[PDB]
Amino acid sequence: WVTFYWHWKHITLWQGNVSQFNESSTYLMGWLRDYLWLNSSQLINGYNPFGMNSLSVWAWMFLFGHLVWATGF
Amino acid sequence: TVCEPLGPDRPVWFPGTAPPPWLDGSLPGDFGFDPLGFGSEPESLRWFAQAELMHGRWAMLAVAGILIPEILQKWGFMEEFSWYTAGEREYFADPWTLFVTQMALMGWVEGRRWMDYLNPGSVDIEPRFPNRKNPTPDVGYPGGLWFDWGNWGRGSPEPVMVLRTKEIKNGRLAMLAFVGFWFQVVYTGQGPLDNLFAHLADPGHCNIFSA
Amino acid sequence: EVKIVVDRDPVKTSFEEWARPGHFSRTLAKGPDTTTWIWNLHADAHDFDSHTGDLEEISRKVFSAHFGQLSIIFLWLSGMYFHGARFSNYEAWLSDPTHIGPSAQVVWPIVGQEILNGDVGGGFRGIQITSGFFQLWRASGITSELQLYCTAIGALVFAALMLFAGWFHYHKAAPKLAWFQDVESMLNHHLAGLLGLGSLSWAGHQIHVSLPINQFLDAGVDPKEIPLPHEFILNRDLLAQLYPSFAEGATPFFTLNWSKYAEFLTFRGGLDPVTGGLWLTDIAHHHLAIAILFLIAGHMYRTNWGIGHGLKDILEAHKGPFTGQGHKGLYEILTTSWHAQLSLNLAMLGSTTIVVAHHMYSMPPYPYLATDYGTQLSLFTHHMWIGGFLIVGAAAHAAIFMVRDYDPTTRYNDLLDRVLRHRDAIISHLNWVCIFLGFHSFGLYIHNDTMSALGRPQDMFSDTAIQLQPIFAQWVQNIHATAPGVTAPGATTSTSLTWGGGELVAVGGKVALLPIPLGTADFLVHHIHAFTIHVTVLILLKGVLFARSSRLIPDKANLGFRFPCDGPGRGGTCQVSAWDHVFLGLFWMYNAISVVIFHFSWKMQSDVWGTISDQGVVTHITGGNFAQSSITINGWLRDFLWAQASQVIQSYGSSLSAYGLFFLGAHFVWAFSLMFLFSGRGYWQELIESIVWAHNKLKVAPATQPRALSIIQGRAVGVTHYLLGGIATTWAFFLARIIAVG
Amino acid sequence: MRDIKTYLSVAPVLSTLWFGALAGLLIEINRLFPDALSFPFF
Amino acid sequence: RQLWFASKQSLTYLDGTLPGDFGFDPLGLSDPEGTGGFIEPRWLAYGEIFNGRTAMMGVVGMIAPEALGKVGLVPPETAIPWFQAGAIPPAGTYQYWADPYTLFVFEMALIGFAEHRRLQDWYNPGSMGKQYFLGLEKYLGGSGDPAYPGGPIFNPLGFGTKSEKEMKELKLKEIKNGRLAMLAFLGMSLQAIFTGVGPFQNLLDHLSDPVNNNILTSLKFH
């Protein structure tokens, strides 16, 4: 939670649009939409049937996480 | 106090049937009709008896107030129009003032009566000059020359249970009459005498099934 | 022989007990010394077999319970028909069903939820529905709110009647044993009586009411001046105008020249372009032939007369060399233990629900059904879920039977004995098959994803790379597309259109069905389905076969069906009861259903559904990226899971906004489940202890001594919350997405 | 009769009726005071 | 006991208790292992009696008006088949001395009075001769058995003089005439549902022309 808060705050400040944070950070759907959904769109397209990118590893590693975690269950 | 146990003295509301045992028939107007057995226990029985008497008396007053002015409109001098629409009739004062005054006074009275029910004889209005012994009570029949000045509820004019039977029967009938009048005005748009005459003219067709 | 023997008035309708909870259980009736009493009360209410020892009383009780269930179902149907009558736009929908959204629920304007009553067209405002009643009410020619109203009334009447019947049959005239235990006449009737005559009377209602009014509506008329149904049977001349043959009374039938009726009873097949649905003539021929089949089937077993078989006279004959004595005595097992019957029937009912789910989409029976996307999708997935739940229940009750009422001394069998005699071989081989399928059906996805993220696409598993071809499926599709040529001359087209041959059916600029090709992605998804099903079967079959006694605990059965463990001894013995086997298998069934429904949604929205241009070019709702993006899990994230989750997440401030809100609560509960699934009890017991102290300090310590839930109830509440979260999440996702885009 | 009274005094039904009455009170207040954010009395 | 299509479950309870037992019951309903309410053999005899009597009255009455209209002096204002009298709206109607519906509910209430009292007698025999009934009390005790009430209200002329044999004859006659009237009523109604012209006119037909034989046509029409 702490790191979510810090990262969203800074990722808004760096783009100069802290206004968006202040507006749509008070309703959870705002967090799921403006913070996770959108900011993940550069990642999940790391590798597609049209090739790959520098981001490939992370995308791969990303999925890796969402697997190992599940195995814990 | 006369009892009406089973037998010929007990004309059963449903011929050929033994009435519920806890329906003795003491209360005038009894015929052994309680298939739901709500009168199972005595406290509920007396409570429902009081409710029945009150409903009957209020229904008599209500049906009189419906009937008489409408017929005195139809043929009499003054024309009292639709009683169901008299609820919204316009008077000197607003309906809410009337409502709150009604509620105040009726709360006073019915609360005194409520305490009399919960505690018989403890709340009564019957003066006592010396050496003349007053009457008791039978709640639902206060007695004394405040509500019985004709000396009818005590003996001479008729054995009591018979007159109370008359009262309860007419009260049930008046309850039916009130609910009928109201339901008719829900369906039709006239008074009771109008429906009556419409039925008289065309008994064969002018009915509920006329449409 | 068989007679009408019953008994008179066992239990009186006296409220003496309602004020005393747990009258049935001797221990429960004593009093709640602690708080676990009020859990244990609900926990064993319906447990009839633990309340007596004779089957007569529990049979009477279940006979009454069935009436309770039927009363609830009738009340539900009545509510549905009412809300259709007094609160829908059904008439406007009938006016033109091409682009008018079925809505059958309005919300009171109190707390800002007016936005819920979104724009649905036709001068109406209301929460859009996807139940799909409207296609039915247009099939049955309701076409008037009076009909819905009176049908709701009649349903209420039947509900009260069934409730009465229940009360009367349990309290006053209780059936006896030789009635219940008499299954021959029950089979005889239910075969001949219920199903057959049912389909027959429905064929009646279709050929004499639906068919003409539906044909008229297809011709195109305002249903106001459409002739009423009874005015189509009283005066013959209308149907005469429609169907010449139909003006010949009953001579062509009785005189065996049935071909005259060929017009309204036929065998066309295919779909009807006017509505994409089925040719109602075909469905009428179907229902009628099925009625005749059930009637001729019903006459098997001897009941009172001298003809007919006996269900004891059929089994014992079958006795093969390997198995030995065969099914001897099995008739007694399946007649002396309710749980056995419950398991068998639940299994068959779940399978039938699944096959109904399947056959629905590929052969839309109703009219204007294959073009109301959300309705088709929601129906299919609902039926799938119901089937899964029924199957799991079947396995659980089979295990319960295995524990309690199985015994070789009197309820003997020589078949089940053999089966149990080699359980280890069964479980071992099924386990190995499960490992094999898991590897060669998921590791393929893993390999494909990895070789994608490593810039080696030409070493992938697809059509454009190392290739796997589902050849048997395409073979069967070719056969089904060339069968109406020679094998089935009496038909006109293929049995459905999804077979790989023919043209496409499109109504109102949208397509309804067309051929369906299978790519390597389909091979992979089919093997995923096979693997997950095999694993669920492994779990549940192991539970059943080992409910009696395992090589770990020697006398498991004596410890009962549902108990938490056998202590931490011998290295730990957690979750050994069959009940816990079902607790486990539930999650795997959930996973199977979830992946199946996701696959269905993607395949439909990527290869069938969509719109058709004026010229005839098709642009599917998602662009047809299945065969190139279903082969990478990262793809599933990107192309399908992330992308098609838009419409639910922007849904705030619109009509669909409700579908948005659930999308969080669904997740939330989903979380919450873990709190119960992961923790234990002793910790919570100590915490409750300290809280009781904190209260007792203030003279507030309640006599209903607080107690953290028992272990089994903890697992139960956990699994319930988890299933709720998952199913609600997929529900909100599906509805929002499909009803927004489609 | 008294049996049905003691049954009616069992916590489920009593709680259901109590909660129904409370919810009705709250929704009626909301009706008669839409959106009611502040305390604009003092 | 002239055996016509009997069985053994019939003879389990049909031991000859009903006046003139013929032995015809393949199904075996009233087997007394568990006595089904309203499947009681007493109730069965009661039902056959009551049904046959009602059928006698109905077969007389439904056919009476039009038939009499033939060469009689009941006017052609009612020359209408029983199934066209008005009971079957898809056939005909008539303007009466009331409206249709209220008439029906009124006659329903009257028949309900009568049959409710009769049923109450059935449960408790003789128990109608206790309550006030504005007279009529000293008659409704009956002759003991609700099957056969007797009483000068229902025994005016006086038969079964000093006898049970005469009662047996008269009574066999009862069962036979009840069954015959049942058959005739059912046949009139089936012709009506399939012929469509009316029974008495069907006699008008079948007096001269033999070739009718309308089972050959089997024409099913309103």
Ligand code: CLA
């Ligand atoms: C004392 C009882 C009583 C009496 C005498 C009447 C009399 C009448 N009603 Mg009525 N009614 C009653 C009770 C009664 N009603 C009740 C309780 C209801 C509520 C369901 C109604 C609802 C009602 C409607 C909706 C309408 C009438 C109408 C009428 C009139 C035409 C008859 C008709 O079609 O309705 C027949 C009435 C009924 C079927 C109601 C059945 C209930 C009663 C109690 C039947 C029982 C009979 C009674 C107990 C025995 C007689 C007692 C006593 C009079 C001797 C007629 C004057 C019509 C009208 O306005 O006239 C033009 C009309 O449209 N009634």
Ligand SMILES: CC1=C(/C=C/C(C)=C\C=C\C(C)=C\C=C\C=C(C)/C=C/C=C(C)/C=C/C2=C(C)CCCC2(C)C)C(C)(C)CCC1
């Ligand atoms: C107001 C209130 C509050 C709070 C509350 C809350 C916070 C809640 C939450 C909640 C959440 C946070 C979430 C939730 C969720 C829910 C859900 C989720 C539900 C569901 C239900 C249902 C019923 C469903 C159903 C279904 C589906 C959909 C699927 C399957 C099918 C069916 C139909 C079954 C407080 C405390 C302040 C106070 C008290 C009151």
